[PDB]
Amino acid sequence: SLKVVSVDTLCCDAGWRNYHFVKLTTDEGIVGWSEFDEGFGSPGVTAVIEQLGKRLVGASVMEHERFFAEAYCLTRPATGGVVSEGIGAIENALLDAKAKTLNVPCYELLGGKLRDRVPVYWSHCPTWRINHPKFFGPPVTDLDGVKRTAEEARERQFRAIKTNIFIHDDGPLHAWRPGFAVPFQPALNVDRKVLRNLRAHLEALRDGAGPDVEILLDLNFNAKPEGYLKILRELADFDLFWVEIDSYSPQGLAYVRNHSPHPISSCETLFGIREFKPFFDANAVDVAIVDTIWNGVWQSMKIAAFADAHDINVAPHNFYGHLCTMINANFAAAVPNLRIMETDIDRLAWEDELFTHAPEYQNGELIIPDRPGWGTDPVEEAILAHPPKVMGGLLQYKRSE
Amino acid sequence: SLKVVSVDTLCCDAGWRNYHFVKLTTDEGIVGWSEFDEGFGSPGVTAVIEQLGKRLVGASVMEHERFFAEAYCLTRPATGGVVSEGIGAIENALLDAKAKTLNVPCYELLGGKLRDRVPVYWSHCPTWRINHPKFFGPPVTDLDGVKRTAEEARERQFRAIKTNIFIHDDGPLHAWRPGFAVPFQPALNVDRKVLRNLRAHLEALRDGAGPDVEILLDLNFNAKPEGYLKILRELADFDLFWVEIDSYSPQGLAYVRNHSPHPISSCETLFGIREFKPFFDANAVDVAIVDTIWNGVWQSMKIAAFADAHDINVAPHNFYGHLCTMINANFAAAVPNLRIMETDIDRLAWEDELFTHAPEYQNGELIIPDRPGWGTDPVEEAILAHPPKVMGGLLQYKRSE
Amino acid sequence: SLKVVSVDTLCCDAGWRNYHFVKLTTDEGIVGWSEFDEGFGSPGVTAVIEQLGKRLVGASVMEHERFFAEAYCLTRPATGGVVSEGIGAIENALLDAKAKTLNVPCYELLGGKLRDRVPVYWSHCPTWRINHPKFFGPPVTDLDGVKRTAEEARERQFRAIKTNIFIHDDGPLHAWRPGFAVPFQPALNVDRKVLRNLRAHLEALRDGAGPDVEILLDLNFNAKPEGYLKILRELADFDLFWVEIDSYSPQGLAYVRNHSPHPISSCETLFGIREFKPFFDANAVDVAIVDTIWNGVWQSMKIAAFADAHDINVAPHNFYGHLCTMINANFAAAVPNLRIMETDIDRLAWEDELFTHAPEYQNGELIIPDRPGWGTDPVEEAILAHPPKVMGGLLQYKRSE
Amino acid sequence: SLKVVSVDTLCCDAGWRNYHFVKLTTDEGIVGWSEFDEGFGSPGVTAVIEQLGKRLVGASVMEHERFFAEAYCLTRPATGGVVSEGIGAIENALLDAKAKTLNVPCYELLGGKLRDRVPVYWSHCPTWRINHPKFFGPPVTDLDGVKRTAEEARERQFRAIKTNIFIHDDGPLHAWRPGFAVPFQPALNVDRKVLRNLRAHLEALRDGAGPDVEILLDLNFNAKPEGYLKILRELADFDLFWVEIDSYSPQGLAYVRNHSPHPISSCETLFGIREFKPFFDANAVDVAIVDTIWNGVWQSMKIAAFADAHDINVAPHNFYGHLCTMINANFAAAVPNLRIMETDIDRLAWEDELFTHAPEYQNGELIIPDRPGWGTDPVEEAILAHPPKVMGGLLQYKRSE
Ligand SMILES: O=C(O)/C=C/C(=O)O
Ligand SMILES: O=C(O)/C=C/C(=O)O
Ligand SMILES: O=C(O)/C=C/C(=O)O
Ligand SMILES: O=C(O)/C=C/C(=O)O
Ligand SMILES: [Cl-]
Ligand SMILES: [Cl-]
Ligand SMILES: [Cl-]
Ligand SMILES: [Cl-]
Ligand SMILES: [Cl-]
Ligand SMILES: [Cl-]
Ligand SMILES: [Cl-]
Ligand SMILES: [Cl-]
Ligand SMILES: [Mg+2]
Ligand SMILES: [Mg+2]
Ligand SMILES: [Mg+2]
Ligand SMILES: [Mg+2]
């Protein structure tokens, strides 16, 4: 019949956060999967999906843009954010199911592949070993460990690494994340302490990385334009692949970029061409980060095309489980204007239990798989062996505090 | 202690949709309430509130902007929409509790009152009698009933009424709501049928209203700029108080307004100064609709001040239960630049059972109450006597179809 | 009755200028106070207050935004400047009275507090010891005294200091203030003499401050854009917390900022969102100075919210008596987007006689008090023991000349 | 010596407001005069003048731009409004004294005259006979009196008349002045009642004026852009010389003008090229009103030149005593780009007692005099025979209410 018979959500432990999944089944017995997240400031996504999936039952699994169009209509007033994440999660499950029904990898729905491998950067490096050492080891607790982590990246043939903001000289090593309320300093002022610690951290990372490995710096939402300018001027003499700055002020981000000696990336939290547009019109970015897990991969192809017309390359936002990596792999396979792909190389001890297939890296690149659908399936029995905790993510840093 | 002890949500039947409430209790035994909605495209608000309220327990009930600032940080990546609605619902409960603790009406927290009564328009008139006749009577099923409803508004001393788009000459009277997927025609084209039915409907309404009662026309998201221009040109010779058009294109809405012989209102679905700004910068509106139930009343005071600087008057979005009306009443009491206040005069048969106090109207104006807090409390026993159904609102029109 | 019974003004000696106060009494016997200034280019404020306060008698003390709205109407043609200062002074007295009536600190009217302490900078350092040595000692008369003053700031645990422009190598140490007619050189040209003396002064200050204490430079209105650029280029290699430039040309200030290696602050002389707007639209500032003594604290909350939407942090303008400090303390307690708070640490020998309570500093921060109202009351008997002189401020530098 | 020996202010009764004067005496015994106003929203001007005139004593009477430059410096922070009115009043007294010293009319200081007579409009017609009937008769209390007043204007050979907003069909004839708080309706909404009364009033005026006399409509600050558009659309079919709209939103006024079938005038409350600039840049006006009594005539020549470069004609703001008329006459004599000159033809019973010379009109034009100075002197004995009342103007309408 090609009809969708069911849309369900599943959830499992990922240590300091949960993983979430959409499971969609068709009349033919094909199962399409996606992975989504609630911990990155996104409570409610499951509820959105539960409501919207009810309308999908009985509809064609082939008609994903029909479903998008209908869902957009039905949630038009509160579009964006958690609503749009729910829609994107369902879209990604539909795509998997459609590809499987046609016996092709998902990239065959996206224009075909135009590359077989994708260069990555090792993300949250050493951020995960500092911030979640119970889950990702070896723990990093000082500048020497920062250096050693970059050395490890170099030895393992990764070509780039991304770090965040850390305070080394004021007690135990800790993250500076005021944009996410740790500490609670909502003006997000940047002082000498921040600047000297950024310098110390990046000098140690560079010492370990050597001169060839690229260093990316993510500042997230942790400053105002004033403070971002102060950081960029302080770090004017560093060799940075990019400086990543999230902002809801296209004019403010553009001002910062105009005064930056480094490439600027942004946009990981934005939805649709509509939200990216003011930033591109303002010349706000060198690189656009596209969260295809949030937007849905089909919507993300639209965003990538829009970026392409502005001669802006895009990078997928990818810092979740293996299924997200494979989802993003298919996007990266198909998009001409691809800057690079993010991935976390630090993995949970039980990561590989949760999925049928693990991503394969060789010489700093991700190998794009050629199996029907995204390239990996969550394993239901394994999900149930790792029951979820309460919401973590941005909420559990604040508990740890 | 002034500490928040608990944050709970409650839900009850409102016929074709549910009402939702936040109940916040302090160490002193004061209860603060707000009302929120999920049916207007907003699945997930309860989940957001459930997560965010956990951080609030143990904090001061007096420190509402502290809570806002923290909540904004913790949900920064997925801000807007359902996330921001959850934050606004909690804010409105905090304000009620704070006002009650200080033994003052909520307007005493908002600058004091500057008016004792507020002119209203009778909203969803005759929209509710056409679309939800099981709940709001007498049913309207033809042009004569449209006329009689406007006559009723005139007799009852209401000074203004707002209608939507209706098709009269193609079978049983029915709403034209393609922007919300009834019918599913996602291009939102406007054809002759739409235009001739708009004319027929508005002529009947004017016939009943007489020459003094004002007529507002809400087009919601039911067209593209092309179609909005076609409607405005068709209706160029009508006397309309305003034409309401929701748009996520500030440049497109500005173009439409620039070519409109009628005042244009918009913005009911927007959050924060940040989202209103591009519309004001573009000269997109005569009147800004502010949903204080969504934004929170404190955030809405910021939006009203911003509008004031642009010499734009604001109107509260108010089409829910009595508590929402009283919340909006307090906002309307305090804001200098107030255009008018929306209210639904068609009420559910059990509406007054659900709340301690009902809004009082005299000569087309709402009387602003002077009780501590918002002016009415939901009644827990009554809530439980009217158990909720599954989500309705935008989802149940589509079931009816 | 909650009625205002009287509005009076009081004035006392502050050495080289006077302090002024509004005293407002309610039917319940509550007294609300504010402090205002005439010496900073503002003759006439008392007269404005005397006229406007007459309309306030008999009105509710609770209805401050009503009074603002009415006063704005009654003075609409000549709004801004001295008129708006009079309105702001009355507003601040109303707020004190309202808070006292409700038995809460003023920050409880402003959203609640979100911080308990506020970092300050020591303003007019060493400006007051150079320019008014009869009142603030030890006198500073050379570069060594400049250095020692910065050392003192460091020892006393202040984290930042702000200086102005001084000429050291052309006779006795003297201020360069052509924007305020000392000397009378109304083109405000910047020559080599200015630049070399700025360098000499700042080098001495840095020598004393050490590397951790931040140095702010206030240039007031003492140049044209051409000259501001010359100063910024000369000082490109200094570590400056900000460079403060007052301008009535948003396009000119924006040009200067665009070419500045230092953060730029401005706006201390502006009134309302309306006046700040062209500067924010032009990307003219890193930091917005808000004079809440001038604007009124309620109006200033509107300005702070507007700034917040542009991701601009604000700093209160605070260089008067203890009551102004406490007024600003309450604003600083409540505003999320707070850059820093100005305060003068050099005090008059009789300062503490004039007020019931003095501000308390610890480790470079101001402690926010928790008494009803602003936190300090002027003492009538003490005011009368220090009778005012003729207007000083900007007028008495010109006498000294 | 050419030194200024004294600067004094004088004040006398003008019925519902006071007239104010600056009297400046030189070492040679020459007396220079100006007239200023406090009642049009401007409490404090006398205090400004009292302070600033102290610096002028001992300076050259010839050096008026020196004094301006110095005064601007000394009041830079609170410039505009009442401060700038005080400066302008002194400037106008300096000009009179300088012209008298050189034995020439003031226009000889302003480029020489380029016309001998100036067409006027009869302002506040029938506004003064409606609003201040105790002082200006015959009283106007109905539409017939409105018609008769326009007939009188026609018979007396005036070519144009200006009215304001009046309500005829809701009790005794009364002014609609919500922008000045009568009534207190600070949203400034425009409803049907306003529109139908505007129509009725203007139809009666046109009936009396006949087809040749021009009708100007002044809306002051009595609406928001939304409401101004509603008025202009309602009155689209009237023949109006201009519609006058005061606004502090150059973008809002520009929007209104862009949609106006009538010429738009504005700017009467603005100071300096700096304040006019955003309006001219925005294409906000057909005609710029320049208040030379406020700005000073020398500053106003700068404003007129600026307007000239934009091909905008200017009109003086002139609705005070005979000295203001003569001040404006000299400006009008000299400015090429002169639209028309305002004047009040309704005079107080004692007007001519207060001044040495009265303005002379012939065939709808003002004859420019050729006496040294402005053309008339206030008479000290007469001033003292008409002692002032408390401040009236905008404050006394509110008493009458
Ligand atoms: O994903 C990041 O780059 C940072 C996350 C955080 O600070 O929570
Ligand atoms: O609230 C309205 O105006 C329309 C709602 C709808 O068509 O669903
Ligand atoms: O307050 C200041 O920064 C400077 C004042 C002055 O030079 O008069
Ligand atoms: O001068 C006018 O045109 C109006 C003045 C007023 O309404 O007070
Ligand atoms: Cl989580
Ligand atoms: Cl902070
Ligand atoms: Cl619902
Ligand atoms: Cl369609
Ligand atoms: Cl002073
Ligand atoms: Cl000079
Ligand atoms: Cl007066
Ligand atoms: Cl109003
Ligand atoms: Mg990032
Ligand atoms: Mg609407
Ligand atoms: Mg300053
Ligand atoms: Mg006028």
UniProtKB/TrEMBL annotation, chains A, B, C, D:
Q: Which Pfam families match?
A: MR_MLE_C, MR_MLE_N
**Residues binding 2-oxoglutarate:** 124, 162, 177, 220
One Gene Ontology molecular-function label: metal ion binding
At the top level, the lineage of the source is Bacteria
The UniProt record lists the Mandelate racemase/muconate lactonizing enzyme C-terminal domain at 143-263
Q: Which SMART domains match?
A: MR_MLE
Q: What is one GO biological process annotated to this record?
A: peptide metabolic process
| Positions contributing to Mg(2+) 1 binding | 77, 248, 269
Binding residues for Mg(2+) 3: 275
> Where, in this chain's numbering, is Mg(2+) 2 bound?
218, 244, 268
Q: Which UniProt keywords apply?
A: Isomerase, Metal-binding
- Which positions in this protein are listed as binding fumarate? 124, 164, 177, 220
| Residue ranges of the TM segments | none
Q: Which InterPro entries match?
A: Enolase-like_C_sf, Enolase-like_N, Enolase_C-like, Mandelate_racemase_C, Mandelate_racemase_N_dom
Family membership, please give it. Belongs to the mandelate racemase/muconate lactonizing enzyme family.
Name the record gives this protein: Mandelate racemase/muconate lactonizing enzyme C-terminal domain-containing protein
Q: Tell me the organism.
A: Paraburkholderia xenovorans (strain LB400)
